[PDB]
Scaffold this motif. Structure first.
Motif, short mmCIF file in Angstrom:
data_model
loop_
_atom_site.label_atom_id
_atom_site.label_comp_id
_atom_site.label_asym_id
_atom_site.label_seq_id
_atom_site.Cartn_x
_atom_site.Cartn_y
_atom_site.Cartn_z
N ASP A 1 -4.23 9.89 3.43
CA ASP A 1 -3.70 10.21 2.11
C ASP A 1 -2.88 9.10 1.44
OD1 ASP A 1 -4.95 12.63 2.44
OD2 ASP A 1 -3.11 13.77 2.83
N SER A 2 -2.17 8.31 2.25
CA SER A 2 -1.33 7.24 1.71
C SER A 2 -1.91 5.84 1.92
CB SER A 2 0.06 7.27 2.36
OG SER A 2 0.75 8.47 2.06
N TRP A 3 -3.14 5.76 2.41
CA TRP A 3 -3.75 4.46 2.70
C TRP A 3 -3.76 3.45 1.55
CZ3 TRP A 3 -3.97 2.57 7.24
CH2 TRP A 3 -4.75 1.43 7.52
N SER A 4 -3.93 3.92 0.32
CA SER A 4 -3.96 3.02 -0.84
C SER A 4 -2.58 2.46 -1.17
CB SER A 4 -4.49 3.76 -2.07
OG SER A 4 -3.55 4.72 -2.54
N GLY A 5 -1.55 3.06 -0.59
CA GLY A 5 -0.19 2.62 -0.85
C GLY A 5 0.58 3.70 -1.57
N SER A 6 -0.13 4.72 -2.05
CA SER A 6 0.51 5.82 -2.75
C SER A 6 -0.25 7.10 -2.43
CB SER A 6 0.50 5.59 -4.27
OG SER A 6 -0.81 5.72 -4.80
N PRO B 1 -4.92 -9.59 17.19
CA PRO B 1 -4.41 -8.97 15.96
C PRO B 1 -5.14 -9.41 14.70
CG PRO B 1 -2.61 -9.52 17.40
CD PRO B 1 -3.83 -10.23 17.94
N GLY B 2 -5.72 -10.61 14.74
CA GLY B 2 -6.45 -11.13 13.59
C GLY B 2 -7.64 -10.29 13.19
N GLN B 3 -8.07 -9.39 14.07
CA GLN B 3 -9.20 -8.52 13.76
C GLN B 3 -8.79 -7.50 12.71
OE1 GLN B 3 -11.29 -6.82 17.31
NE2 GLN B 3 -10.21 -8.42 18.46
N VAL B 4 -7.49 -7.20 12.67
CA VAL B 4 -6.95 -6.21 11.75
C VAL B 4 -6.04 -6.75 10.65
CG1 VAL B 4 -5.48 -4.15 11.59
CG2 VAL B 4 -7.11 -4.39 13.48
N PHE B 5 -5.27 -7.79 10.95
CA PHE B 5 -4.34 -8.36 9.97
C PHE B 5 -4.75 -9.76 9.53
CE2 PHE B 5 -1.16 -5.08 10.91
CZ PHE B 5 -1.43 -4.77 12.24
N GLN B 6 -4.48 -10.08 8.27
CA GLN B 6 -4.78 -11.41 7.75
C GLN B 6 -3.66 -12.34 8.19
OE1 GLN B 6 -5.98 -11.86 3.59
NE2 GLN B 6 -6.20 -9.63 3.38
N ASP B 7 -3.88 -13.65 8.08
CA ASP B 7 -2.82 -14.58 8.44
C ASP B 7 -1.87 -14.61 7.25
OD1 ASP B 7 -4.49 -15.79 6.60
OD2 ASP B 7 -5.06 -17.46 7.91
N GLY C 1 -12.03 -5.84 5.72
CA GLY C 1 -12.96 -5.00 6.46
C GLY C 1 -12.28 -3.78 7.05
N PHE C 2 -11.19 -4.00 7.78
CA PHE C 2 -10.43 -2.92 8.39
C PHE C 2 -9.88 -1.99 7.31
CE2 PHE C 2 -6.25 -1.21 9.68
CZ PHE C 2 -6.63 -0.46 10.80
N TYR C 3 -9.39 -2.59 6.23
CA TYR C 3 -8.80 -1.83 5.14
C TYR C 3 -9.77 -0.86 4.46
CZ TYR C 3 -5.59 -0.61 1.41
OH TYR C 3 -4.79 0.11 0.56
N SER C 4 -11.03 -1.25 4.31
CA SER C 4 -11.99 -0.36 3.67
C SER C 4 -12.61 0.61 4.69
CB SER C 4 -13.10 -1.16 2.98
OG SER C 4 -13.91 -1.86 3.92
N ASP C 5 -12.69 0.17 5.94
CA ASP C 5 -13.27 0.97 7.01
C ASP C 5 -12.44 2.19 7.42
OD1 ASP C 5 -15.49 1.10 9.12
OD2 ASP C 5 -13.70 1.12 10.40
N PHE C 6 -11.13 2.01 7.53
CA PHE C 6 -10.26 3.10 7.94
C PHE C 6 -10.45 4.41 7.16
CE2 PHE C 6 -6.32 5.56 7.70
CZ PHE C 6 -6.10 5.83 9.05
N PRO C 7 -10.32 4.37 5.82
CA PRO C 7 -10.46 5.59 5.02
C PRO C 7 -11.87 6.17 4.86
CG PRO C 7 -10.27 3.75 3.57
CD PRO C 7 -9.97 3.22 4.96
N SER C 8 -12.89 5.37 5.15
CA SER C 8 -14.27 5.81 4.99
C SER C 8 -15.04 6.04 6.28
CB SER C 8 -15.03 4.79 4.14
OG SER C 8 -15.11 3.53 4.80
#
Length: 387
Positions: free
Chosen positions: A207-212, A243-249, A287-294
């Motif tokens: 529900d809050s994945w977009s930031g709101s 960690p680079g698989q999930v977070f950007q540098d 990639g991780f950011y769009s994958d999580f909610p979908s």
């Protein structure tokens, strides 16, 4: 050592009934003097292996405060500072904490674990939002505290209660589920009052994945979300190798040491240790950011789901408290939980809302307001009645 074994214990200070009443007057009056104690004990890790943890114990006493007293297990909120000990924090605050002023001062013996990986615990990380270890740590803290109480000959009624705020609400409910499922003889649970907890953990993140979310901006999302990801990886070891698989540098290389670490969440948020929520797309890998909610198969999402606290039937009178102004942990969590409980045959859970009822007050910061407001409400509406 057997689970619950008391390793060390120490008394820090005590606050008078009048001193507490004075803090309340700034009207509720305290009825008990409050003694602050700390202790360490044997418990288990996430794999059932031996581990240690620390805890806080608040003991009431006084001429107008004879026992027996109920035993209230408490779950504290998110803590990113590894060394933080609740007992020493209360001591530093010279008694200025609702656990002292609203509960212990009224005759409630309060016991809280600092959790695995925090305080004096020897665990290498903190299993943030991990139902099993939040419960095991809490249960074993209560076992050890009882040993301290036995030695002091503190009169206990035998009645046990549970409560907690934020992550602590998740802890309180997880502990309640475990006791009802296996330890009802050891702990006579008569009341549970989780406060602002993310019971529908997976859905809360979605529900809050977009930031709101529907309530407002999830301002602390980058910090809380990062703690969750790093902790779930430590606990389940099934999200990433690097960690680079999930977070950007440059975030990937600096995120793990922070949860928990040398900084408090307050410090991190005030000094921009991590980017603000508006820059979430530059924080997480796209990639991780769009994958999580979908994708329900997303590993982090799966780990959150394993820690949902919805599929069971609560037997103990329970009161979920929160605020409809809360954008950090939407009250939808309590509503969802109750609907799930009722579907499973339980009518033991009620809900109370401390919100203003005005959307103008909706905010991520409204979350912190529920700590004391709800402690007062649940004590008055449920805890006192079950003593």
């Amino acid at each position: 050592p057997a689970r619950g074994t008391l390793l060390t214990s120490n008394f820090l200070t005590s606050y008078t009934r009048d001193a507490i009443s004075a803090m309340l007057a700034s009207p509720e009056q305290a009825k008990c003097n409050v003694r602050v104690a700390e202790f360490t004990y044997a418990t288990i890790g996430v794999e059932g292996e031996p581990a240690t943890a620390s805890g806080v114990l608040l003991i009431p006493g006084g001429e107008r405060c004879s026992g027996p007293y109920p035993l209230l297990g408490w779950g504290h909120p998110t803590e990113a500072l590894r060394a933080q000990e609740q007992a020493k924090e209360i001591r530093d605050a010279k008694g200025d904490d609702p656990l002292v002023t609203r509960l212990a001062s009224q005759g409630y013996v309060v016991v809280g674990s600092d959790y695995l990986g925090l305080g004096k615990s020897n665990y290498a990380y903190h299993p943030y939002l991990h139902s099993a270890s939040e419960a095991s740590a809490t249960i074993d803290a209560m076992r050890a505290a009882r040993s301290v109480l036995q030695h002091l000959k503190t009169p206990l009624s035998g009645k046990v209660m549970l409560s907690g705020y934020s992550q602590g609400g998740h802890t309180a409910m997880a502990t309640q589920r475990e006791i009802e499922a296996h330890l009802s003889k050891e702990f006579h649970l008569v009341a549970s009052a989780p406060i602002s907890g993310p019971y529908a953990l997976e859905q809360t993140f979605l529900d809050s994945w977009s930031g709101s979310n529907a309530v407002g901006e999830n301002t602390f999302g980058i910090l809380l979300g990062s703690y969750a990801i790093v902790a779930m990886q430590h606990t389940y070891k099934n999200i990433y190798l690097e960690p680079g698989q999930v977070f950007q540098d440059p975030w990937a290389a600096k995120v793990e040491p922070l949860f928990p670490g040398k900084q408090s969440l307050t410090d991190m948020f005030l000094n921009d240790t991590l980017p603000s929520i508006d820059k979430v797309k530059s924080y997480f890998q796209p990639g991780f950011y769009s994958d999580f909610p979908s994708n329900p198969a997303n590993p982090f999402r799966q780990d959150l789901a394993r820690n949902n606290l919805l599929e069971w039937a609560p037997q103990t009178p329970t009161l979920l408290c929160g605020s409809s102004n809360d954008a950090t942990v939407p009250l939808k969590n309590a509503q969802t939980a109750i609907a799930s409980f009722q579907q499973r045959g339980s009518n033991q859970v009620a809900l109370v809302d401390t919100g203003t009822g005005n959307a103008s007050d909706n905010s991520a910061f409204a979350h912190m307001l529920t700590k004391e407001s709800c402690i007062v409400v649940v004590r008055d509406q449920l805890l006192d009645k079950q003593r």
